[PDB]
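Sample intake — INTERLEUKIN-4
Collected from: Homo sapiens
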Amino acid sequence: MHKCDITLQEIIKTLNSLTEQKTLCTELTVTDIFAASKNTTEKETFCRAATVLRQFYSHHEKDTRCLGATAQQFHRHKQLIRFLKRLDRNLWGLAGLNSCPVKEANQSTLENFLERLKTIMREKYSKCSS
């Protein structure tokens, strides 16, 4: 019946935002663990995942190559990072691990990575349910 879960709800809104309004920083190609989830489980996927994302936002905070466009973009990136972090925090819950190394697949231009994650979560929000 419900929710299924709280992490989900939070996550969803966070994934939603990130993609809805993408930037000049969501093309900073990160690892596409989905194409390396080949023979693992959702959790594990979500473990490399967690790691990948965590690092990505933490490291770009002061990249100011993409968020050093003008003023608008600067703020744009700022927003993004906050949401990226939000992802990690809650994601961990679903995952059910701690953290894992990165066994690279191919690369995903963040906006894309997010869209995938987003869809997944949403599907498992309603077909769980509801």
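Post-analysis note: The chain has one domain: 1-130.
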